């Protein structure tokens, strides 16, 4: 028996057999090894095999397959790189009383950032109505250490959860860690920090005769420390104006985009 | 005749054969077949090969290759996660009369957002030949049910496509679903709605003493109900001032960031 | 011998040899080559072995793997789709006199165009020890034809480098064209193209009493012409207020977000 060596074949006490090296090895774990040891390949991290034996990419958060069978980012239905309260939100939200508003939030992972937008718009009465002495309006957000919004915060927890369709997860999730605001950026503290906000000039229904300044903060002032609910990670939004004024006007807010540093 | 069958080989009908595992299977296309089948690799979704026969990850939209073979993402040349004007667009948009403004915009895919960048520039006249009794300027775009830019728009349709290095695919797009604003954030209606809307004050020319509004508007009020021309997507940014101011001034906008909830 | 060529086996001569296809090949640089060739999978690119022998999908910027080994988009221990000056820069950058700043930006690659957020804070005085009939304060990054920072600018070279963790890469950067402006967009000009600067009213420690405005430009008449320091690309900061105010408060902003589109 003559064989090629120089085509992967090779001997074994004079009995032939493949010489397989890289990419290639020997499945152990058949049925009836070692006498039946077929060759097969030898994969690892991001290759995973088909149904059907067949060698495909194994694909993560923010991946998926087009139509071709080719690799493209977006994701097929769920979306884990998206934390929201859902494009339409129901009331979900108090500002003076439960359930007095409709708090539209999207958080969208960009890496070391996060692009968000806003809006806010109160479904049971005017301004004078939920505020009082109070020419400002104030929705909170309170994160433990796992980026899981707590029960101190103003907005429910039901429909605050990952992007699927949409629509959410129908479970909740146990960690955003990655949306949450840098700590090193933004450091929890007592004191406003010029950093920790974003301050701009907006308009009350959009109205340019209507200005309103909206604040909003990263951890620092915004941070929960009250006896058992301390938040690791925190977010508000707050909307002022000269007192006396829309005192008879519906809050509604235009959609506001900002971004800042992910803690990871 | 010996085979060390724990090495891939096998015997059947005494004849010396392969006995393939996962990850390989026989070639039974190949002009010479079924008869003589060689052994090449069982692959699926996200793998691919090239003209020389290697293997290679099948990379869609989004995603490429570095120079050292690894996977990383962006397109530097066909874009599908952009959908542009080109950064340096020609007269291409209608204010008042044809061609008489260069329009730029980017609408940059980031998953469940777009972000957009906007800009303006006049570029037959002041501000006078283009108003009337109107101190406002316009620039309207809409989408039929696939994210096509209709006919009834301010911008020209030719250079309004997916990105391709510094400039657009020669071939028109079919459908930009995904960069339309979703339509359960910012419903289609007759009433102006302040989360459809995004409002700031800008400056003509960035200058201090020139203020003006800028309105962008998702969807309801900038939607077309024209018979035949009916919209189901839309945008349009709407620049206004003090009547009878900057009569004499060129329109020329900075340029201007904002985001939103994408369709899909 | 009997063979079964329809089985990956053939006949070259005699030989009992592997007919190897697509995905396959011999290696021809073992120890014991060119005559002992074991039989191994061709790969490509996207693709690379393990210290192990296994294959796994090469993967480059912007993607890892996470537990179950898939492929998801996101990178800790190294971003190179982040080039910032760290989330807390210690004094950095310079207004007047050296180290009299800690300037935070950070740049994030969003595909065609740069999600970004700013903010500076003064470390060793007042408005007045800044300025003096200035009534503004600028901070001024010029980038070389590979993106490298200039020597002529603000913000000190040491930690302006690519992500790690909450950290910067080890070793300089020695390029970063895919973060700067892009020049058909934003051209090098002297004059004040008004589509090269983006402007906003913004306020100092965010007091709604204390407006100033923000005019960033990009490229155009922030590039630099001196004599053998002529930079390719820029970027500036300007924060400009009424004369005669705030002399005795120190130099604080919000943060700011803002994008443009990339060179490449």
Redesign the interface.
């Known amino acids: 028996?003559?064989?090629?060596?120089?085509?992967?074949?090779?001997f074994?006490?004079?009995?032939?057999?493949?010489?397989?090296?890289?990419?290639?090895?020997?499945?152990t774990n058949?049925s009836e090894?070692?006498?039946?040891?077929?060759?097969?390949?030898?994969?690892?991290?991001?290759?995973?095999?088909?149904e059907?034996?067949?060698?495909?990419?194994?694909?993560?958060?923010?991946?998926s397959?087009?139509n071709?069978?080719?690799?493209?980012?977006?994701?097929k239905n769920d979306?884990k790189?998206?934390l929201?309260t859902?494009?339409?939100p129901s009331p979900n939200c108090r500002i003076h009383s439960d359930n007095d508003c409709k708090f539209?939030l999207?958080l969208?992972?960009?890496?070391?950032?996060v692009?968000?937008?806003v809006?806010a718009?109160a479904v049971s009465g005017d301004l004078s109505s939920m505020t009082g002495t109070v020419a400002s309006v104030s929705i909170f957000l309170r994160f433990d250490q796992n980026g899981v919004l707590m029960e101190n915060s103003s907005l429910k927890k039901h429909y605050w959860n990952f992007?699927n369709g949409?629509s959410t997860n129908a479970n909740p999730y146990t960690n955003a860690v990655?949306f949450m605001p840098?700590l090193?950026?933004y450091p929890k503290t007592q004191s406003?920090?010029?950093?920790?906000?974003?301050?701009?000039?907006?308009?009350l229904?959009?109205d340019?005769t209507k200005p309103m300044?909206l604040?909003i903060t990263?951890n620092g002032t915004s941070e929960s420390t009250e006896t058992s609910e301390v938040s690791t990670y925190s977010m508000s939004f707050t909307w002022?104006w000269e007192s006396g004024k829309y005192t008879t006007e519906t809050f509604?807010?235009?959609?506001?985009?900002?971004?800042?540093?992910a803690q990871?």
Not at 12 to 22: L, Q, S
Not at 33 to 50: L, R
Not at 68 to 74: P, R
Not at 252 to 261: C, G, L, Q, V, W
Request: glycine share 10%.
């Open positions: 028996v003559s064989i090629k060596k120089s085509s992967g074949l090779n074994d006490n004079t009995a032939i057999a493949i010489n397989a090296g890289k990419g290639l090895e020997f499945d058949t090894s070692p006498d039946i040891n077929p060759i097969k390949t030898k994969i690892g991290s991001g290759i995973d095999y088909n059907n034996g067949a060698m495909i990419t194994k694909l993560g958060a923010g991946l397959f087009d071709s069978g080719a690799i493209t980012i977006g994701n979306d790189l998206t929201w859902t494009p339409d539209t999207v969208t992972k960009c890496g070391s950032q692009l968000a937008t809006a718009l992007r949409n990655g840098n090193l950026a406003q920090t010029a950093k920790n906000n974003i301050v701009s000039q907006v308009y229904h959009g340019k300044i604040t990263l002022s509604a807010t235009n959609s506001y985009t900002f971004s800042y540093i990871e």
